[PDB]
């Protein structure tokens, strides 16, 4: 093959650009955002993913500035970054060198779906836990991902480690400042987002995680629909018609419309009878009309549904040990520090 060399800037470093060489360049992803390459470093021989996007250069890249602030085991790490050309000459391309992660949660869940099987609860516990852990991290910086979906949840089948990716729709939410409501991926949109609310918080990610948890248990998306109304009908068909104050919490502009009152469908009749009650309990406190009523990511990690993960004798179905789930930092626990009593087992701290 051929070896390419560029002067790339360390993402989490003190801004000291260095030489970086790589080979085995091939495309593993194409989209309207740009192109994603796979590559092997000439130095360590490690595989990386290269997200190549366009840049207006007149203004700073929001995705880059967020990634440079992130260092977490459950968020894909920014190795380096550099600028180059590509298709459509006379423009500057931004290259994000990221940790290469083989699979995604979606593709894995899709396997059991077409195999007519059910994703084992232990994986539902593992994947969801690491997700909230990632959510708890970025929320402490006031950074909202806004595009939480199974496709953006990368997996390493061997170590069973989850790494959140695609911060292209991410934004640091400032209190009392307007926000785009046409954000987020459908099926996983919060009800306030569908109502056009621009005063939404980071709890929209919690709603999305709730959709993911439900989809993993159900084998299919819980709120399908092309349009916003379509999705909202599906939500109402489960949670029931939202009350006036619940509507106020989401978007006050829809407070006085008198929608037909539909009875809520029991959570137990929603999932298969094989479903553990704890999973159902976690889901009900996740999918709430009122944003403030929804659990915080850090609070979700301490749910009883994840008690099996805090067992000393827990093991992966392939024999290997579970990933680091208890290495919480202080910034990570900034939301609610007394939760460490539950989140960190006695056999972990000692």
């Amino acid at each position: 093959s051929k070896v390419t060399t560029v002067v790339a800037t360390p993402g989490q470093g003190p801004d000291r650009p260095q030489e970086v060489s790589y080979t085995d360049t091939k495309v593993i992803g194409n989209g309207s955002f740009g192109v994603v390459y796979q590559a092997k470093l000439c130095d360590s021989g490690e595989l990386v993913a290269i997200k190549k996007v366009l840049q207006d250069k007149r203004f700073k890249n929001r995705e880059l500035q967020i990634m440079r602030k992130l260092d977490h085991c459950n968020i894909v790490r920014l190795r380096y970054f550099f600028y180059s050309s590509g298709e459509k000459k006379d423009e500057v391309y931004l290259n994000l060198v990221l940790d290469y992660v083989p699979e995604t949660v979606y593709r894995v869940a899709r396997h059991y779906s077409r195999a007519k099987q059910t994703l084992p609860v232990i994986y539902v516990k593992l994947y969801m836990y690491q997700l909230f852990r990632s959510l708890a991290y970025i929320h402490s910086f006031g950074i909202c991902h806004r595009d939480i979906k199974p496709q953006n949840l990368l997996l390493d089948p061997d170590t069973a480690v989850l790494k959140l990716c695609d911060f292209g729709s991410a934004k640091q939410l400032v209190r009392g400042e307007p926000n785009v409501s046409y954000i987020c991926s459908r099926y996983y949109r919060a009800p306030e987002l569908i109502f056009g609310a621009t005063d939404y918080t980071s709890s929209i990610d919690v709603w999305s995680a709730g959709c993911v948890l439900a989809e993993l248990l159900l084998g299919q998306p819980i709120f399908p629909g092309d349009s916003g109304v379509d999705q909202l009908v599906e939500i109402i068909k489960v949670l029931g018609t939202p009350t006036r104050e619940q509507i106020r919490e989401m978007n006050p502009n829809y407070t006085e419309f008198k929608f037909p009152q539909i009875k809520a469908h029991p959570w137990t009749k929603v999932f298969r009878p094989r479903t553990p009650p704890e999973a159902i309990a976690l889901c009900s406190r996740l999918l709430e009309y009122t944003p403030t009523a929804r659990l915080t990511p850090l609070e979700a990690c301490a749910h009883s549904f994840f008690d099996e993960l805090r067992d000393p004798n827990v093991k992966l179905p392939n024999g290997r040990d579970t990933p680091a789930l208890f290495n919480f930092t202080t910034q990570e626990l900034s939301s609610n520090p007394p939760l460490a009593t539950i989140l960190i087992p006695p056999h972990a701290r000692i």
């Binding site: 056009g196 009908v233 018609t241 419309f257 037909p260």
Partner: peptide
């Protein structure tokens, strides 16, 4: 008149699944 139009479509859909 965005919320007015949106609400009507929703009410219409909800009256049908009632």
């Amino acid at each position: 008149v965005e919320p007015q139009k949106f609400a009507e479509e929703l009410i219409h859909r909800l009256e049908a699944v009632q």
